[PDB]
N, C-alpha and C. Protein backbone atom coordinates (compact mmCIF):
# COMPACT_ATOMS: atom_id res chain seq x y z
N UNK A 1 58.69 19.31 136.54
CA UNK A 1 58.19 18.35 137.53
C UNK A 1 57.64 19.03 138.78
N UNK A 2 56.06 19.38 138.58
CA UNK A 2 55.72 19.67 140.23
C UNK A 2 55.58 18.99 141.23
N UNK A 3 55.73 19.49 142.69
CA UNK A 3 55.67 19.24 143.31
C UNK A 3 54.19 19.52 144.29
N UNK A 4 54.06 18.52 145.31
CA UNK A 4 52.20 19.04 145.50
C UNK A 4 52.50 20.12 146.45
N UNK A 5 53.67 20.57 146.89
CA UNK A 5 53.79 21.94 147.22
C UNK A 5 53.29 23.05 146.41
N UNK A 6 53.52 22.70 145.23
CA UNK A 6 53.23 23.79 144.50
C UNK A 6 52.31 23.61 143.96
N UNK A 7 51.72 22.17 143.78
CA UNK A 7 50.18 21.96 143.04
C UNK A 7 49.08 22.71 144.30
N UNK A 8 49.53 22.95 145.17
CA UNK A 8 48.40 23.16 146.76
C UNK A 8 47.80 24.90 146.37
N UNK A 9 49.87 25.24 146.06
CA UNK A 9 49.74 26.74 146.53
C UNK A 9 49.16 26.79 145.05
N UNK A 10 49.16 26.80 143.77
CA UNK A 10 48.69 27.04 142.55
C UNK A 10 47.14 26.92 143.28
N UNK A 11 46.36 25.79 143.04
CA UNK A 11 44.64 25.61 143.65
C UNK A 11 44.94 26.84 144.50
N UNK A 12 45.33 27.01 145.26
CA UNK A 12 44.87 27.62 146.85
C UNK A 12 44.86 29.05 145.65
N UNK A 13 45.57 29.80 145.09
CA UNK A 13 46.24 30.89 143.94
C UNK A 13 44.77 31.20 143.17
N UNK A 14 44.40 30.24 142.85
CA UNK A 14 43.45 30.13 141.51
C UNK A 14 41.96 30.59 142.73
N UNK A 15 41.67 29.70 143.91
CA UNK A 15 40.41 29.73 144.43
C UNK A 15 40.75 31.34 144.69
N UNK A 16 41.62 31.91 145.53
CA UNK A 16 41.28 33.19 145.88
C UNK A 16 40.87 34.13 144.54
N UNK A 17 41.60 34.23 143.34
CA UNK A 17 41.52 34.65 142.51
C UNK A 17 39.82 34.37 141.96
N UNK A 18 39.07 33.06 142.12
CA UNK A 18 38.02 33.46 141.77
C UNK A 18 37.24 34.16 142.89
N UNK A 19 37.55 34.29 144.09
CA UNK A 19 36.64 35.05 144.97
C UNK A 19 36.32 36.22 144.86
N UNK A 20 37.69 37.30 144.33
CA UNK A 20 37.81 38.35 143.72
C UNK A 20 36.89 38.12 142.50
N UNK A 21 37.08 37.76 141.38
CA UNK A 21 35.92 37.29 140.36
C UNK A 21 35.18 37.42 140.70
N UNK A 22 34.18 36.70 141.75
CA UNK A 22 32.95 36.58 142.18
C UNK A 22 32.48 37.83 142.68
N UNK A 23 33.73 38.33 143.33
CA UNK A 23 33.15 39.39 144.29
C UNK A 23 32.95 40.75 143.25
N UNK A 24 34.04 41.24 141.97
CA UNK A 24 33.43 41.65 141.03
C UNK A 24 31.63 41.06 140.48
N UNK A 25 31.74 39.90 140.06
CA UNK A 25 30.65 40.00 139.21
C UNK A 25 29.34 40.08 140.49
N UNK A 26 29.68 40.45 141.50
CA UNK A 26 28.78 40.31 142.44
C UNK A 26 28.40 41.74 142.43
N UNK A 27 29.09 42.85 142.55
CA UNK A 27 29.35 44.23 142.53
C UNK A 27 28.27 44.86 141.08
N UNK A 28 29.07 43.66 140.25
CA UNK A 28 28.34 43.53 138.66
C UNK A 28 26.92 43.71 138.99
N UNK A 29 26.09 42.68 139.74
CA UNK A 29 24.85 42.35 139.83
C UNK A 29 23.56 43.27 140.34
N UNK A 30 24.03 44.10 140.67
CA UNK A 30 23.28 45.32 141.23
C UNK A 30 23.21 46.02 140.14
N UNK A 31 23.15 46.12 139.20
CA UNK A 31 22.74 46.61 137.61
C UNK A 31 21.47 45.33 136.68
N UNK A 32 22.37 44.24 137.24
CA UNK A 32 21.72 43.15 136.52
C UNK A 32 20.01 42.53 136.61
N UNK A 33 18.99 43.47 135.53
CA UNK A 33 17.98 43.11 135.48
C UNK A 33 17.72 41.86 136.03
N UNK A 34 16.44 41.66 136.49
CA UNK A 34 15.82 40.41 136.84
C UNK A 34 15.50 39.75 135.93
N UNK A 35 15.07 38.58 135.67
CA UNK A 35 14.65 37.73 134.61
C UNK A 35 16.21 37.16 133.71
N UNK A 36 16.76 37.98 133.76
CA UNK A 36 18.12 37.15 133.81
C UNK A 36 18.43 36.28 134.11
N UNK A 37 18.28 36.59 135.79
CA UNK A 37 18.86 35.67 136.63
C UNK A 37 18.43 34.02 136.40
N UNK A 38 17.31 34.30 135.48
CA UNK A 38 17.28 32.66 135.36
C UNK A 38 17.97 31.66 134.81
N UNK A 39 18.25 32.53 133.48
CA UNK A 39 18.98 31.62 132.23
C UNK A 39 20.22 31.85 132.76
N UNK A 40 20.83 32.74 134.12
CA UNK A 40 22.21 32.62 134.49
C UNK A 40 22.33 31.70 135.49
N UNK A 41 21.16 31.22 136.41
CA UNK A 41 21.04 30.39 137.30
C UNK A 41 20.84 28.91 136.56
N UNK A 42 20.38 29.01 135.43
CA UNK A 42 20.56 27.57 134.65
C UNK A 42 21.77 27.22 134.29
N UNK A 43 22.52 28.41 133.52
CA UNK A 43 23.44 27.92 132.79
C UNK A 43 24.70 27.63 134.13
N UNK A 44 24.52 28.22 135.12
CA UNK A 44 25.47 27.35 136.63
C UNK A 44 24.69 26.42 136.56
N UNK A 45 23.90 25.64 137.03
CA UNK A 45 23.59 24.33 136.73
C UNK A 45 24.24 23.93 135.79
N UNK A 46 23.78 23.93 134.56
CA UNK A 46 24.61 23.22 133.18
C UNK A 46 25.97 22.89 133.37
N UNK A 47 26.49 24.38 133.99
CA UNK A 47 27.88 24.04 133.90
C UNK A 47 28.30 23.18 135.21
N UNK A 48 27.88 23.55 136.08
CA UNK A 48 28.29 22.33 137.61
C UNK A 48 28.10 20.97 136.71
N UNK A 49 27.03 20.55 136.21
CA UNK A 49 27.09 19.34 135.46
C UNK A 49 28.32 18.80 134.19
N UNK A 50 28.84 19.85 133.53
CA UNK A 50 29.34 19.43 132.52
C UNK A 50 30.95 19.46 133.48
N UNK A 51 30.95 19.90 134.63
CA UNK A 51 32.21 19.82 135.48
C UNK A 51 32.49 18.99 136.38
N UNK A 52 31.49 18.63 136.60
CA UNK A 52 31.18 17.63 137.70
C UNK A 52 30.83 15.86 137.08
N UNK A 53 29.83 15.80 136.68
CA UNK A 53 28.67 15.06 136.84
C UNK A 53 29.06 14.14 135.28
N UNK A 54 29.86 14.45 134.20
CA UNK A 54 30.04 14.17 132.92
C UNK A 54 31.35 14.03 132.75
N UNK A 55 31.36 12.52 132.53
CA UNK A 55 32.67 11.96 132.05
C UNK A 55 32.97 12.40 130.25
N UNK A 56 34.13 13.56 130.96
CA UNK A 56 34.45 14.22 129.69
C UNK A 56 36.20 13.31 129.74
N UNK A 57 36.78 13.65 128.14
CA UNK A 57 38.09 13.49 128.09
C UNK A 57 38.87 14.34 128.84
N UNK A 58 38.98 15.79 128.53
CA UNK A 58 39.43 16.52 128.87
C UNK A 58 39.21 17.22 130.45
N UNK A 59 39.27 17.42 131.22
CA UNK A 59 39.06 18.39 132.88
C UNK A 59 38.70 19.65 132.67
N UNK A 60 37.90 20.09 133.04
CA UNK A 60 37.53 21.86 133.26
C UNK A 60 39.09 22.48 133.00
N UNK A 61 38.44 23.48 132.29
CA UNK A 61 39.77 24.66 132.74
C UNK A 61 39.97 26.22 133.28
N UNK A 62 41.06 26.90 133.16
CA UNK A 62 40.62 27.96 133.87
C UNK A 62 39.68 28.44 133.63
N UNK A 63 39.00 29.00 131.86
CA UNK A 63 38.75 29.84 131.54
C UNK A 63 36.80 29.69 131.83
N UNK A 64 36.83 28.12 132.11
CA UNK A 64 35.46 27.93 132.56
C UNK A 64 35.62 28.21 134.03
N UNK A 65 36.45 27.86 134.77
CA UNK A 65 36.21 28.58 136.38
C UNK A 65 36.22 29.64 136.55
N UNK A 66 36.99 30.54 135.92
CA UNK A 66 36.49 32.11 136.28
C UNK A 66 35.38 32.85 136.08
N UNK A 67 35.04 31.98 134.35
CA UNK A 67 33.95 32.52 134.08
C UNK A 67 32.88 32.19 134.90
N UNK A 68 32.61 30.60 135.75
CA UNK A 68 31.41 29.94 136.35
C UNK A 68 31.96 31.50 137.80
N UNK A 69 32.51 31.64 138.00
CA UNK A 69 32.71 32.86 138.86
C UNK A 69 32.46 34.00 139.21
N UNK A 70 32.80 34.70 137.89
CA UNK A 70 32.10 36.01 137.94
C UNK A 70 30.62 35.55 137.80
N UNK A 71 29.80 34.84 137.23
CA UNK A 71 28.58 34.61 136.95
C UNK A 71 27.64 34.41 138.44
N UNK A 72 28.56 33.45 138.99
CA UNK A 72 27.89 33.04 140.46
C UNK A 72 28.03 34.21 140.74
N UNK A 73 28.83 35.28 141.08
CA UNK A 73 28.69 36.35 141.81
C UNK A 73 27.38 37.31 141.44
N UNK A 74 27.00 36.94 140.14
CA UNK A 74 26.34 38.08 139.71
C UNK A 74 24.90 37.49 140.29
N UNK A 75 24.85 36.16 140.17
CA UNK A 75 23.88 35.72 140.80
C UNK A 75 23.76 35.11 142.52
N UNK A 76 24.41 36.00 143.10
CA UNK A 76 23.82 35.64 144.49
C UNK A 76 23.87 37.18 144.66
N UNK A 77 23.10 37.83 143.70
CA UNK A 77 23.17 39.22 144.14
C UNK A 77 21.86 39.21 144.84
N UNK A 78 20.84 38.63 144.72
CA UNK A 78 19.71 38.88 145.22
C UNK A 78 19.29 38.39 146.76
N UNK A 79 20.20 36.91 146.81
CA UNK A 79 20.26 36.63 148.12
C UNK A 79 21.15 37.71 149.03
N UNK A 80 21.82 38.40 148.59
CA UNK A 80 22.74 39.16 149.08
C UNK A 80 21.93 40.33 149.51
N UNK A 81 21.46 41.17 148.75
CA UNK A 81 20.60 42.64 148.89
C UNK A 81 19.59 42.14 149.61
N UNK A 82 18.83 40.86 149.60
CA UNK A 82 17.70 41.01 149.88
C UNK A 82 17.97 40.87 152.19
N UNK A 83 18.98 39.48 152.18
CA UNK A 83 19.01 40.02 153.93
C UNK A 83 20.40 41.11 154.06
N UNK A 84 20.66 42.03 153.51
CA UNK A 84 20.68 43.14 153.42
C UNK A 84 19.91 44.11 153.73
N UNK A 85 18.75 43.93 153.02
CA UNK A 85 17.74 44.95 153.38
C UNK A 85 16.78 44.89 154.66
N UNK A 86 16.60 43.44 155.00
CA UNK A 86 16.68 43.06 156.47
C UNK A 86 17.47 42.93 157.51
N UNK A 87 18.47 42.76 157.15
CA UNK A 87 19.39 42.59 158.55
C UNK A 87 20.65 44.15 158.43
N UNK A 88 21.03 44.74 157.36
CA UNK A 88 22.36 45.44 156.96
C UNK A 88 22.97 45.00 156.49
N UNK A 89 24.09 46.04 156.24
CA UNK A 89 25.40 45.31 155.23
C UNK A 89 26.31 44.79 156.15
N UNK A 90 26.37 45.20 157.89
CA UNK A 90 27.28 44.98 158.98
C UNK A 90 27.41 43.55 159.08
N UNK A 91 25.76 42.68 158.80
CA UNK A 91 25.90 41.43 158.50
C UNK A 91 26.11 40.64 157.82
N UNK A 92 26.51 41.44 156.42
CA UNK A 92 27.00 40.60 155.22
C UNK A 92 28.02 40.40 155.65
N UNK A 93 28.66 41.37 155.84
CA UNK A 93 30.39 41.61 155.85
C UNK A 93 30.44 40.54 157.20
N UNK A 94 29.67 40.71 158.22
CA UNK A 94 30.13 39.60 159.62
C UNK A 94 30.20 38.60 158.91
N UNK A 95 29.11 38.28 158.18
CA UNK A 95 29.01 36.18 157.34
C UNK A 95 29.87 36.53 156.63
N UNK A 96 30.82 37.03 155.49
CA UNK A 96 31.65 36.62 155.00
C UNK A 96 33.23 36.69 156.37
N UNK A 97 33.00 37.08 156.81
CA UNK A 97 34.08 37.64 158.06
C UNK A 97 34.40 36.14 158.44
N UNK A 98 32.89 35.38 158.73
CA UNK A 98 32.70 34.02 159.36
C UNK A 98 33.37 33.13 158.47
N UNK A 99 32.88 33.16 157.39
CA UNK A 99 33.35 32.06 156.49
C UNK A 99 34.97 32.05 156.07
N UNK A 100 35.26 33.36 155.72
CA UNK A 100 36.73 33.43 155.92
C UNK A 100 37.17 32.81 156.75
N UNK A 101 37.31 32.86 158.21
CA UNK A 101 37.87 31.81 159.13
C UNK A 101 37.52 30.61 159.17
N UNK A 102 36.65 30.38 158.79
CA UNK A 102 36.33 29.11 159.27
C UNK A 102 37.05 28.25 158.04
N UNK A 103 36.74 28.86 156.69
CA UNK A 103 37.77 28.78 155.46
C UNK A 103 39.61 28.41 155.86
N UNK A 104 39.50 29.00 156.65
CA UNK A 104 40.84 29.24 156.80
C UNK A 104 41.34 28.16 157.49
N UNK A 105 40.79 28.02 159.29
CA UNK A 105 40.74 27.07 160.05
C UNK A 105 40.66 25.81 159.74
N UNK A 106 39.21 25.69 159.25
CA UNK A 106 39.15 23.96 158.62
C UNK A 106 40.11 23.68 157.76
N UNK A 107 39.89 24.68 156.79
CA UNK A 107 40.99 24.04 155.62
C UNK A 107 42.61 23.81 156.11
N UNK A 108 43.07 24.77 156.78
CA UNK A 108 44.40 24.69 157.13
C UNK A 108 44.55 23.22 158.48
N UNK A 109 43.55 22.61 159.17
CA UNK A 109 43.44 21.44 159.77
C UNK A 109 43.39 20.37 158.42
N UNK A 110 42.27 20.60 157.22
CA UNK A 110 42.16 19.53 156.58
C UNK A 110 43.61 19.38 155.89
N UNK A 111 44.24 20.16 155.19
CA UNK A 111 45.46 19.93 155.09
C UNK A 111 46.40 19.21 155.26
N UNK A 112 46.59 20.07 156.69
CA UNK A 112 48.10 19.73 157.63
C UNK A 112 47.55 18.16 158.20
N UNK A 113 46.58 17.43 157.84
CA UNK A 113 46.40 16.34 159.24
C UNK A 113 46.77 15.24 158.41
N UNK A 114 47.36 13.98 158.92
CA UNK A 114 47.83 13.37 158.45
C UNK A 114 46.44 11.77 158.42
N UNK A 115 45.17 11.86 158.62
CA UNK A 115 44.36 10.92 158.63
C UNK A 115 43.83 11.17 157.53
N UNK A 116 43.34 9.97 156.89
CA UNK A 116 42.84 9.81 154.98
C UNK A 116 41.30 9.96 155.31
N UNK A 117 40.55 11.50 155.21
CA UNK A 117 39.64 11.49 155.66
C UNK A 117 38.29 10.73 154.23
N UNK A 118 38.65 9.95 153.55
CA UNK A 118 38.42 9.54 152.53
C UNK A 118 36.63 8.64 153.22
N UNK A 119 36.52 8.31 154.27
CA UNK A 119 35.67 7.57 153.98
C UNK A 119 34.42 8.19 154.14
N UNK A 120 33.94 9.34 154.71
CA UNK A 120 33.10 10.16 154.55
C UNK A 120 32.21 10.92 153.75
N UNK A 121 33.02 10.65 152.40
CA UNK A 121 32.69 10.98 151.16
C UNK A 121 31.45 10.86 151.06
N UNK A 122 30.93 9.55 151.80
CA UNK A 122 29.35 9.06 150.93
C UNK A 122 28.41 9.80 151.95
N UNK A 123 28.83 9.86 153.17
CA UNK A 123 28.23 10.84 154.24
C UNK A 123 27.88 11.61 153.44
N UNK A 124 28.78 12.89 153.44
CA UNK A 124 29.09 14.14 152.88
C UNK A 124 28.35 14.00 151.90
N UNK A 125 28.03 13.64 150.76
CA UNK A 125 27.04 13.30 149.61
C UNK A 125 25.99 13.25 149.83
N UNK A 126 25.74 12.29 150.74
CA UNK A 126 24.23 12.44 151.42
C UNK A 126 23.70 13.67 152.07
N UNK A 127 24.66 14.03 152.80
CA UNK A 127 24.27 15.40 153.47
C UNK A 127 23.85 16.15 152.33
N UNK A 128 24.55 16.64 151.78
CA UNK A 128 24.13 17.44 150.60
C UNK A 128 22.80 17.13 149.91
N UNK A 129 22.96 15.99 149.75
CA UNK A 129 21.93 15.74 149.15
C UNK A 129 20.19 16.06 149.68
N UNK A 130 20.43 15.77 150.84
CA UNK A 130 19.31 16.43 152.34
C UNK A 130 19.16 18.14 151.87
N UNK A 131 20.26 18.44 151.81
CA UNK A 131 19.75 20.49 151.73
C UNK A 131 19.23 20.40 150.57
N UNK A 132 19.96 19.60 150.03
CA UNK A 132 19.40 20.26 147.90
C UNK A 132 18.17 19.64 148.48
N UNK A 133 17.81 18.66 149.08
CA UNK A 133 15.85 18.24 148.71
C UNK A 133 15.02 19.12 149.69
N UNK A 134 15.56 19.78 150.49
CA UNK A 134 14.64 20.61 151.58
C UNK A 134 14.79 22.11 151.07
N UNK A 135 16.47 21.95 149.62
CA UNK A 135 16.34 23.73 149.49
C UNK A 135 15.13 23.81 148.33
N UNK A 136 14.93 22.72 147.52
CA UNK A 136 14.12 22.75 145.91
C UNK A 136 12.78 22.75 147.02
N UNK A 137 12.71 21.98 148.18
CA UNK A 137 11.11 21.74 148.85
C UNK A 137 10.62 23.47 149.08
N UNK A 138 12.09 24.07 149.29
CA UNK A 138 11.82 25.52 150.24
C UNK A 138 11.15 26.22 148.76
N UNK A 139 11.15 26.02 147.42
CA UNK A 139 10.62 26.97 146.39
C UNK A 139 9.20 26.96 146.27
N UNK A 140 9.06 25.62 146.22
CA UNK A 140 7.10 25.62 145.94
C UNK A 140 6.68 25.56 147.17
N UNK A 141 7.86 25.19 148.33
CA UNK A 141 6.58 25.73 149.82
C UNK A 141 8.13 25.98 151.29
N UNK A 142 7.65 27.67 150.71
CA UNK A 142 8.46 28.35 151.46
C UNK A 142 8.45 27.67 153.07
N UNK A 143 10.00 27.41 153.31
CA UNK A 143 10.06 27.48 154.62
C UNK A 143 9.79 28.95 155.98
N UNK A 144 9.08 28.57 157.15
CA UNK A 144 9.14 29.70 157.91
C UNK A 144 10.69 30.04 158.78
N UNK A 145 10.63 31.17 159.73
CA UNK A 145 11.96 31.57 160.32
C UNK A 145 12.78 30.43 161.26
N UNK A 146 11.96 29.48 161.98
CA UNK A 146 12.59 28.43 162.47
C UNK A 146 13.02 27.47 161.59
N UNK A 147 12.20 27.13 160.73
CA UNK A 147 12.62 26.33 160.07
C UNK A 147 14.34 26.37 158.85
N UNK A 148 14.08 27.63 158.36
CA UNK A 148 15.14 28.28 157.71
C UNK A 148 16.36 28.29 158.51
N UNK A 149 16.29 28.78 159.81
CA UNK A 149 17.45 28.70 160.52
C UNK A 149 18.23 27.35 160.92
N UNK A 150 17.60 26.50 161.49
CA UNK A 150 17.54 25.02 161.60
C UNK A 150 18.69 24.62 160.17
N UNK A 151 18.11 24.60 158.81
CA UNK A 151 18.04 24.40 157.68
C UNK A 151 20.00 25.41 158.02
N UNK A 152 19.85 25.91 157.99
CA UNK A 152 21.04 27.49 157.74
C UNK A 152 22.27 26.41 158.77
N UNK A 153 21.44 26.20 159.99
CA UNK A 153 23.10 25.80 161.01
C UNK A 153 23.27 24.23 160.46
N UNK A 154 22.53 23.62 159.89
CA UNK A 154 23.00 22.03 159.52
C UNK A 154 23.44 22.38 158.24
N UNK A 155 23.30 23.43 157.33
CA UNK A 155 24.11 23.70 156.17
C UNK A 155 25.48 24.01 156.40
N UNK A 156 25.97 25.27 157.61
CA UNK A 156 27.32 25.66 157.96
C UNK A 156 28.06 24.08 158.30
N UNK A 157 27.44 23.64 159.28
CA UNK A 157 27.34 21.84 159.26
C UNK A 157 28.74 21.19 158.98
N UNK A 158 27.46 21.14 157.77
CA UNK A 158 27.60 20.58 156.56
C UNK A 158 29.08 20.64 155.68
N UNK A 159 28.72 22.38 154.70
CA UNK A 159 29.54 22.47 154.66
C UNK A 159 31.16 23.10 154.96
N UNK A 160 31.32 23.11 156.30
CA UNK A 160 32.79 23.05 157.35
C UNK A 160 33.26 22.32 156.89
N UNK A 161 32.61 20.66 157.25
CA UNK A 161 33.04 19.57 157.58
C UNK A 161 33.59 19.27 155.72
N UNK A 162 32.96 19.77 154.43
CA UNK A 162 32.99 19.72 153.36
C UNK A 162 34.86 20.29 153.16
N UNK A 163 34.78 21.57 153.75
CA UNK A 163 35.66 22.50 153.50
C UNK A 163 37.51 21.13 154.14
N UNK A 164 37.16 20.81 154.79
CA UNK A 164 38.31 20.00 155.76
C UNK A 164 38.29 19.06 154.71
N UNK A 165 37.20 18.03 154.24
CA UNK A 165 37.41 16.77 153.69
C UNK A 165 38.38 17.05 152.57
N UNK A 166 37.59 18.14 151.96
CA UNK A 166 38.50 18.68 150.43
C UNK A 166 39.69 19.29 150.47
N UNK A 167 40.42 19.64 151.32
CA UNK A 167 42.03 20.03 151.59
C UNK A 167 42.57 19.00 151.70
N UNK A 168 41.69 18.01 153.01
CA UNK A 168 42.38 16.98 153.43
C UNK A 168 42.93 15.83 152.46
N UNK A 169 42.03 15.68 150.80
CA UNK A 169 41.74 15.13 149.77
C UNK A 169 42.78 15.70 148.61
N UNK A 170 42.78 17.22 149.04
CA UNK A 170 43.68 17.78 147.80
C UNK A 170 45.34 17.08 148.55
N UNK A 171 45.06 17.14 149.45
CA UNK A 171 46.63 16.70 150.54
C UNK A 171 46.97 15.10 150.05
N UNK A 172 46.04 14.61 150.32
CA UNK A 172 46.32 12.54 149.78
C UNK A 172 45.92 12.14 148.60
N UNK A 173 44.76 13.11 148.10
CA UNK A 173 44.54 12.39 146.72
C UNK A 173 46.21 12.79 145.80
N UNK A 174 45.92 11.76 144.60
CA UNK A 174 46.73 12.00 143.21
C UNK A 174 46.44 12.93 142.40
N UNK A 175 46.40 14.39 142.66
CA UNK A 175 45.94 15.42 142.21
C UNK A 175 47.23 15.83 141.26
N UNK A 176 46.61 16.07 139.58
CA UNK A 176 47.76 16.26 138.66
C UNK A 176 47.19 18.05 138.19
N UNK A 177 48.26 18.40 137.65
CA UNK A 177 48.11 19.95 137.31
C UNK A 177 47.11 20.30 136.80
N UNK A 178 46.16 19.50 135.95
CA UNK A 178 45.30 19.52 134.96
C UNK A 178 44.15 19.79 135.56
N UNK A 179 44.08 18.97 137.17
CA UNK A 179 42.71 18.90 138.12
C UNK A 179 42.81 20.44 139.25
N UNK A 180 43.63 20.89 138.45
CA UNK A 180 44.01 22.21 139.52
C UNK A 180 42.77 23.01 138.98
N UNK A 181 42.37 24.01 137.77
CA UNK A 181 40.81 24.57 138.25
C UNK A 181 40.05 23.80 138.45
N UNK A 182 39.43 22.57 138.84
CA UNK A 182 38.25 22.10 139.31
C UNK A 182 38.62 21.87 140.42
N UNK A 183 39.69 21.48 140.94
CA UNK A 183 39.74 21.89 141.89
C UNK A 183 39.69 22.55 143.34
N UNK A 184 40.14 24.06 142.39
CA UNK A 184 40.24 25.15 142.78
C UNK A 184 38.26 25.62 142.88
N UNK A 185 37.56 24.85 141.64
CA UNK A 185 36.22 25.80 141.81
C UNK A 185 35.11 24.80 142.90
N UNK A 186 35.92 23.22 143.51
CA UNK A 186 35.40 22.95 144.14
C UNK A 186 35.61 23.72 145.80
N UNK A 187 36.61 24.33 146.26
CA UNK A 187 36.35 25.18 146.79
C UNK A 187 36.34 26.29 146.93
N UNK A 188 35.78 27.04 145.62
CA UNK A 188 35.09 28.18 145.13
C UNK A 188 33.72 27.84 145.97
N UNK A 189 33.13 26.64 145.35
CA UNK A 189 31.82 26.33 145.69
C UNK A 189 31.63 25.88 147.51
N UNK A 190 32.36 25.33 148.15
CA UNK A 190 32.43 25.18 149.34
C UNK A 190 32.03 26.13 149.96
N UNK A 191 33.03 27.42 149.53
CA UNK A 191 33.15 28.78 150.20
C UNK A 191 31.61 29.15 150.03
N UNK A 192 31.66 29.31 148.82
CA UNK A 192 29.79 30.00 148.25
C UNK A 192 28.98 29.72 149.18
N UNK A 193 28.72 28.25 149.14
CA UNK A 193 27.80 27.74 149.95
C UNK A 193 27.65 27.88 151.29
N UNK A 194 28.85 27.76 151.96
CA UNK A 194 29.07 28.11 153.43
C UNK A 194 28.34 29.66 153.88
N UNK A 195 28.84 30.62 152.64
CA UNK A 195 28.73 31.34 153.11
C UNK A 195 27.30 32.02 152.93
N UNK A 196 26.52 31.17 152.06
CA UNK A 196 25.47 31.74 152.00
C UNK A 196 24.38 31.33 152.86
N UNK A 197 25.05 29.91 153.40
CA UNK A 197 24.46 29.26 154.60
C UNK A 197 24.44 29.89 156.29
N UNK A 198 25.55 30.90 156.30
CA UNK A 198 25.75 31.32 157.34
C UNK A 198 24.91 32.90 157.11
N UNK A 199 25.01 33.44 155.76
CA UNK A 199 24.27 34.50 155.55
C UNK A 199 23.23 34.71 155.58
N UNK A 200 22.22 33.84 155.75
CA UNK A 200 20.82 32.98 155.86
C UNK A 200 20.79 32.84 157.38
N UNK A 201 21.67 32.41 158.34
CA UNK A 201 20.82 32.14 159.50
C UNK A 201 21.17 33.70 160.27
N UNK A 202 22.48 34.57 160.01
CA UNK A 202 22.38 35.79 160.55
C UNK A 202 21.74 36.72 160.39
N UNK A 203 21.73 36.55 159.02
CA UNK A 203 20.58 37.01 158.87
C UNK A 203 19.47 37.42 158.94
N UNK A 204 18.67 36.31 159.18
CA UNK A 204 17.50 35.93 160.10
C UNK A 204 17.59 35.92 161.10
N UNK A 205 18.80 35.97 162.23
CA UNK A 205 18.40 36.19 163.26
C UNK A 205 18.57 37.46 163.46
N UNK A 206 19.04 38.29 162.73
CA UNK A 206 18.89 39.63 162.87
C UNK A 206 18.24 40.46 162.31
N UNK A 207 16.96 39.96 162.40
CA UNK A 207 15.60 40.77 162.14
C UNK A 207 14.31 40.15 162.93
């Protein structure tokens, strides 16, 4: 019989464990030919969908979150090297430095607070939904440096406020053992995003 003491610390167990993952297959990715990256950037799509988006019987399990893990890592290798090669590595390491705390902060507020931050949800959806249509707009017509940045601080935003709802949610929702890796890879993905949102505007401003 668990307790959501221990359903918290298990998720909380599992997300760090894929960061390590990630951060391997990220390490991975600096070998990893180009043209790859596509059918690996699809098949994360596919799978966010078959985890998300598709009423299955069964719930994700570990062996698909680690794997959707190391994979993401291998694929944000390019966003990674590339403001790298513009800004340094001093600023990778600062944006993940950032996101760590702020990881830490929000989540440990969304947690501990005792208000059902439940009704925001459809906000929060929408928001998202705003970057995904201005990030697919940014492919066939590149955004410039103001604009990107703009785009970068309403993403950190964004997802902070993401990072709090979903602790605050793992804290009140009816979360059973089973929902522990999806869970866990919904803030896998929080983190990702945050941090690639914050890696994007330091990026840029440091060049």
């Amino acid at each position: 019989h668990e307790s959501k003491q221990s359903i918290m610390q298990r998720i909380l167990t599992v997300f760090v464990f894929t960061l390590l993952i990630a951060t391997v297959g990220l390490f991975i990715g600096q070998f990893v030919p180009v043209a790859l990256m596509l059918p690996l950037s699809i098949l994360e799509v596919a799978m966010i969908i078959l985890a998300f988006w598709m009423r299955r019987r069964k719930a994700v399990g570990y062996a698909f979150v680690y794997t959707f893990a190391f994979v993401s890592g291998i694929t944000l290798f390019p966003i990674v090297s590339h403001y790298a090669s513009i800004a340094g590595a001093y600023v990778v390491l600062e944006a993940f430095g950032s996101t760590f705390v702020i990881f830490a902060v929000l989540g440990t507020i969304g947690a501990k607070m005792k208000k059902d931050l439940s009704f925001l949800w459809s906000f929060l959806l929408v928001a998202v939904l705003a970057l995904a249509v201005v990030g697919i707009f940014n492919i066939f017509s590149p955004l410039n440096s103001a604009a990107m940045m703009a785009y970068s601080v309403i993403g950190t935003i964004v997802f902070s406020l993401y990072i709090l709802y979903d602790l605050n949610q793992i804290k009140h929702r009816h979360i059973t053992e089973d929902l522990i890796p999806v869970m866990a890879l919904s803030l896998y993905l929080d983190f990702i995003n945050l941090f690639i949102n914050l890696l994007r505007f330091f990026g840029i401003l440091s060049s």
